[PDB]
Design a protein. Sequence first.
Length: 138
Amino acid sequence: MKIVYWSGTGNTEKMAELIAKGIIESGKDVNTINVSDVNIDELLNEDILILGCSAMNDEVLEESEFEPFIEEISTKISGKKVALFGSYGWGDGKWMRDFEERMNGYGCVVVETPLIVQNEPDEAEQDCIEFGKKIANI
Ligand SMILES: Cc1cc2nc3c(=O)[nH]c(=O)nc-3n(C[C@H](O)[C@H](O)[C@H](O)COP(=O)(O)O)c2cc1C
């Protein structure tokens, strides 16, 4: 499997790592890829797309790298299964509600409730691992 993410200070990156650990613990292999190093063609062959991005202003996906990536794959992901996650600070998850709506709008099937954690995982570490385990059970 593959996990693609954008992280500005490392919070979402840490989540990606933990999610990967859960998939690996379930017996499967997974590679975490920063959005800047992703190859669209290879990503599009995947059964499930696991995508993560922290909340940027104002309650939107990161604009210089992540959003362009999403816009680029938008027309080629109808029917694909996707799992969403990300870290946020002061909001209540609005950016993720929108991200979920957007992906559904492109024809994707959002397989699980998006995982959102405030700031660094730390206390939510097991939650991240468990989310990975749920995806591996799909
Ligand atoms: C410029 C900027 C704008 C932000 N806007 C929001 C926002 O609208 N809502 C929110 O909850 N957090 C907001 N945050 C906080 C980040 O989502 C939060 O610090 C998160 O933990 C960053 O994760 P990352 O290290 O993976 O980037 C913003 C952070 C930055 C740097």
